[PDB]
Amino acid sequence: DKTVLDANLDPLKGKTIGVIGYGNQGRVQATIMRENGLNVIVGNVKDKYYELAKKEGFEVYEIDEAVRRSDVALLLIPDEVMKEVYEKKIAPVLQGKKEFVLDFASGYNVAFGLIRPPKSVDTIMVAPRMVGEGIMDLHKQGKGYPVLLGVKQDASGKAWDYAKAIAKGIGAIPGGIAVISSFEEEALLDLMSEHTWVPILFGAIKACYDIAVKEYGVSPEAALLEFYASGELAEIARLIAEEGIFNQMVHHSTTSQYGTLTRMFKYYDVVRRIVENEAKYIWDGSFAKEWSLEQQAGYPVFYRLWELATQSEMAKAEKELYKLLGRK
Amino acid sequence: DKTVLDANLDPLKGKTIGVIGYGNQGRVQATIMRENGLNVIVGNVKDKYYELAKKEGFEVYEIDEAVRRSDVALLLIPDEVMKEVYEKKIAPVLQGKKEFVLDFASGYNVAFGLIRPPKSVDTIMVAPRMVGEGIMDLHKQGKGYPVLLGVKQDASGKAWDYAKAIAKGIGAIPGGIAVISSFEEEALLDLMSEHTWVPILFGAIKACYDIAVKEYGVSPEAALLEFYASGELAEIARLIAEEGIFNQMVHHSTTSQYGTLTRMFKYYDVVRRIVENEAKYIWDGSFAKEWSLEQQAGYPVFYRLWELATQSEMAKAEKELYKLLGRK
Amino acid sequence: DKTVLDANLDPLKGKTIGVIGYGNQGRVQATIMRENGLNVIVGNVKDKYYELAKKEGFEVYEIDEAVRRSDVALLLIPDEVMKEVYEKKIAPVLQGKKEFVLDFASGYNVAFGLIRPPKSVDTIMVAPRMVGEGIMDLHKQGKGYPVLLGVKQDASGKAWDYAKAIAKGIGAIPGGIAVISSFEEEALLDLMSEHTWVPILFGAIKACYDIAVKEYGVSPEAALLEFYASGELAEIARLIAEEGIFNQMVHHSTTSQYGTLTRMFKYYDVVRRIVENEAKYIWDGSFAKEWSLEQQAGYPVFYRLWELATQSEMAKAEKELYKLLGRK
Amino acid sequence: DKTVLDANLDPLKGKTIGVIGYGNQGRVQATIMRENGLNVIVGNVKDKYYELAKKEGFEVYEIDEAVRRSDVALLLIPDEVMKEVYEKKIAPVLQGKKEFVLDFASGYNVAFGLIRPPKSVDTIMVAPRMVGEGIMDLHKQGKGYPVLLGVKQDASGKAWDYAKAIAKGIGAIPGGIAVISSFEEEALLDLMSEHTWVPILFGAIKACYDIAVKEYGVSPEAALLEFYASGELAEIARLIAEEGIFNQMVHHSTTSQYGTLTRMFKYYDVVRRIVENEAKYIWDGSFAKEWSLEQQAGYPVFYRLWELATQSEMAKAEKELYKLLGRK
């Protein structure tokens, strides 16, 4: 209905694509755009990555020289230091440009207003949904994969066609799909998943273990095998990915289905509440402030929590165990 | 009783007044002090404003050169960037001075400790209560207007006479009045008005509209005419300004007076509570911290809220309407 | 979309329009209908107003004689004594009529069932949204202005065309607009504005003053200048009327915008609650009962509240002040 | 300090005093003013009272004829029907007057706005504090007694001297005293005593009896003797009147003093709350509305409560008892 499946590849010919960063996403996006018939250069600071990106053939300059040559740029770099870079190097050059297309992999720095490029620029988003590595395995098979798209500002009337051109340039289509959206509807999710259903999982596990041991008299080496020290989790995750979330449960016995569904519908509101709270905290722009300040202070809380979890009890016992199974 | 009406104009003769900034307040204060028989220079950075302030005759240097020549300075500039300026340019020069008089239009940066000048300085406040423009219309008529005054530090024994000298130098007296106060009793109000009775007004309106439409089946184009899209508001505001707040209501019918007064006395405590909370939040110095940090982060929340209100529903409908009345 | 801009002026020719009352709305409506080519008479009791309405040329009889001659009547009189009049004089005459058109400026007496005319009558509403005076200034410029319309009962199939005919007869269109609605959706608003966002404003102000003085040690003569004794209010009301409610705030500094918006979104629910309560109190018809009874008792509460507010503290100090600025 | 003890008796000579009503207060006030050297007439409707007031020498006309002759009037009649009378008869005559002095015994009808005389009238209050009868016994002894005074409106500059003239005209001074006050501070008390400490007394007694009987197994004929069927109450009331409220308790044993004082200080707040609530209910003007409406409906609730209390249990048993002691 609203899930674009393919487009043309016209605009990006006659132009040069200067890519920034050569990390996880950078490598594959670069190689794919190259293999699909596009001229490319690369921009990165002179470190270990520089040698490699040079190795694979790309003609590499440093950043400003790169943006100066391209009418397009893929800012494939972290979500934290982008601000400093944009303010030190790029913007001075942006003002020196006429028509320029800016693409990101994440809108955390845009949606929340931390960047405000000129009006003479085409602003867009291209959001892969993958770890980054397996994309290669999915590529050699010729299969595409999903992505999200959106615009924040356009002064050329043709932002979307450039967006889809790139969508093809990375091979995620055809074969996969590409959704159209906004920056907000992307960061919102990328953070909701991180704030709501993941940490709750971790806490539930950490609590079941502690309860069992300290109250019902269980041995530590036992629980961990049942809870996560076995591959059960990833197996059922795969069943979800392929066969469906709910239809998955048939492979389990009824005695499991009943106890699962009853509770699922029993403890639903309790977490809906939490999700509402957190989503509202985000939509307003608070979390960005929180994180930015913690950056401006020295990552104290980060430090203390990383010390606690690792120096917790469950982690100690798990270390003993892994030490016992021959693993790391 | 304690509302000074006029004083003498002695101290500021034989001295030079170097004014900083030439914005809204700067223009009129400058012109008035000039027309009342005082030598003046002007201090501003080389931008658009510089050309104009030069146009109107004032001999303009840049800031440091200005403060170096005057025994007095009127820091008529925003309430946010004053800190950076004072720390970069002025203080080095303050230490080079012997007797200097510092005047402001707002004490937000002083009362909350963000500035701490030397002990060899006369610190004062002069607070006009006007938009800035209409002061001219009130001046040509020869009428004064009200102001607030106060001191934070004095090492000359004669701060108040300089204060009143200036009070005359801007023409707000005689004809108007001048109150004596402190910096705190000024910022406190300038912020209470912004935090308590204004936003409550806006929220009440925004809520009445939403309720009417979404629940009682009203058309959007209708409400806005009753609530604020008509000039009712400013009319009664004027009646308040001139004839009195309460006596104003006679012009309205009784059926309005009853329903207004009963509720006024019904919902009084509810807002007294809020006002207490906010005033306490201020007196302590929290809001200053909040705002300063939000400045040090990139105005995220500012951004998101400005996006919400504008992209709300009421604003959309109002835009359609104004588009329909031929206005902007 | 649903905002009529003009119609024809056919039905009201060959007929006579007998107007009742000659107060604020009566004068201008009368003069305009006369200047747009319509025969008119006037109905009022023999008091001061009678002499004037006669002065301006209108051939005046007393009421019953007027309704007897016209097929239309504009009941431009208060919202309180209309009942007594309708029951004493008009209804006896209504029964003597064949086809008659009844128009009001407010539906408080209709929507709430206090009047129930025959079935042989055309019932309509015409609701100007103005103080009444400025309409003249808006008329000489040829500009129209907004109004609300609606029907309660029709036995002629052509109520709406008479409504629009009148809409033109008063000059509010063209140039302005005219909305279509019901009686309820009119009184509801005319009362919500009086019950919710006005008295809350007054109470917030009255509370800020009291708090400041009695707790934080401020002088009375000071606050009033900041809160309402200055023309700030009407200025920003005008900015709302013209440039938009929210876009208005740009002229203020950021430090104001932040503190305003955060709170606006913080204290929203608190007042939504109140608005719901009051709107429900109205929709049901309670307030009408309350007011009618208080009329049948002698306006005691009215009396006591008017004594309190005037004999309050804030009003005393404001009287001293106005006495000090040379105003009344 | 502020307790007038005597004044002169000048103004009321050369003038005629027309008194209204001849009930409890009327008789003694009339006779006293006559015995102190003043001309008097009387105003009352033609009923039983008329014959008597004529008997005692007073030259009696009916009301309007009376007010027409006097420059003063004492409206010694109930607090309920005064409105009807004032509106039917007096006001038409008031407008026919030049200088007139209006005195009352209670301000319930004034303070609460139920009467609004012209501006050409001297309005005052004179409030005896007595049953009405014992005043005679206190008069023959030559002793005065206390009263309250106040003004609501004066257009003669000499209201207070007329007030004190009357204060002497009724003999309550000298020997007694006269306080100066307002109408509000009079009705407020006359109603607080009726609403707070009296009914609480009655309820406490009614509850002790019921509790004792229905729970602790006591006979009805017993309790009533202890609680109120004995003269204990009036005895200690007299001790209060004469020797002091607290010093009274010495005559009782310590075992009583302890249990009384501890509880007095234990249950203090509980009733302070109630008193606040009721006083606020009054100050606002609600009770007046309540009562007026109940008058306009037919005294239903009055009826039902009078039926309940009388047809209660305690009253039945008390009737049996009084029937047993030979009393009524």
Ligand SMILES: NC(=O)C1=CN([C@@H]2O[C@H](COP(=O)(O)OP(=O)(O)OC[C@H]3O[C@@H](n4cnc5c(N)ncnc54)[C@H](O)[C@@H]3O)[C@@H](O)[C@H]2O)C=CC1
């Ligand atoms: N698994 C993943 O990491 C995925 C990445 N993304 C998005 O792509 C971007 C990052 O992806 P990757 O680069 O592949 O992961 P990454 O975290 O390994 O990125 C490291 C790269 O950042 C560059 N870099 C780091 N610090 C720099 C600095 N101060 N100055 C200049 N360059 C610096 C380095 O050249 C390095 O190659 C983010 O926006 C992320 O949201 C989206 C899907 C998942």
Ligand SMILES: NC(=O)C1=CN([C@@H]2O[C@H](COP(=O)(O)OP(=O)(O)OC[C@H]3O[C@@H](n4cnc5c(N)ncnc54)[C@H](O)[C@@H]3O)[C@@H](O)[C@H]2O)C=CC1
């Ligand atoms: N309607 C108003 O704006 C009123 C102003 N005030 C107070 O006066 C001061 C501001 O008044 P206005 O200047 O008339 O309004 P404004 O906001 O238009 O001030 C703009 C002026 O600030 C100068 N300026 C801005 N940024 C600068 C920077 N980085 N470096 C050097 N100069 C800079 C500019 O020369 C410009 O002329 C504030 O303290 C305010 O509280 C008091 C009453 C109301």
Ligand SMILES: NC(=O)C1=CN([C@@H]2O[C@H](COP(=O)(O)OP(=O)(O)OC[C@H]3O[C@@H](n4cnc5c(N)ncnc54)[C@H](O)[C@@H]3O)[C@@H](O)[C@H]2O)C=CC1
């Ligand atoms: N600013 C305003 O007053 C506006 C008026 N309206 C509506 O129009 C009507 C009133 O408007 P206006 O007359 O202009 O204001 P108004 O309150 O000055 O009306 C006074 C008129 O009512 C007449 N009148 C008063 N008592 C009377 C009585 N016992 N018997 C016969 N006639 C009596 C008088 O002739 C007098 O001319 C109301 O329905 C009101 O809701 C609508 C918009 C605003």
Ligand SMILES: NC(=O)C1=CN([C@@H]2O[C@H](COP(=O)(O)OP(=O)(O)OC[C@H]3O[C@@H](n4cnc5c(N)ncnc54)[C@H](O)[C@@H]3O)[C@@H](O)[C@H]2O)C=CC1
């Ligand atoms: N124990 C008391 O009754 C005291 C009386 N007062 C105040 O004095 C006034 C009443 O005092 P009293 O007359 O002595 O008690 P009251 O209740 O016995 O008054 C009865 C008198 O009212 C007259 N009256 C009753 N209905 C009338 C009507 N429709 N039209 C014309 N006249 C009518 C009658 O002539 C009758 O003589 C009240 O304002 C009361 O607050 C003050 C202190 C106590």
Ligand SMILES: O=C(O)C1(C(=O)O)CC1
């Ligand atoms: O792993 C589980 O939870 C099983 C169950 O008892 O349902 C064994 C399959």
Ligand SMILES: O=C(O)C1(C(=O)O)CC1
């Ligand atoms: O604007 C209002 O609220 C009015 C009322 O009904 O009281 C018309 C004057």
Ligand SMILES: O=C(O)C1(C(=O)O)CC1
């Ligand atoms: O400080 C502020 O934002 C101002 C106000 O009037 O509230 C403009 C001076």
Ligand SMILES: O=C(O)C1(C(=O)O)CC1
């Ligand atoms: O009447 C009482 O309450 C007494 C007591 O026991 O204190 C007998 C005096």
Ligand SMILES: [Mg+2]
């Ligand atoms: Mg993420």
Ligand SMILES: [Mg+2]
């Ligand atoms: Mg994710």
Ligand SMILES: [Mg+2]
């Ligand atoms: Mg401010």
Ligand SMILES: [Mg+2]
């Ligand atoms: Mg202000």
Ligand SMILES: [Mg+2]
């Ligand atoms: Mg109204």
Ligand SMILES: [Mg+2]
């Ligand atoms: Mg209104």
Ligand SMILES: [Mg+2]
């Ligand atoms: Mg009483």
Ligand SMILES: [Mg+2]
């Ligand atoms: Mg009493």
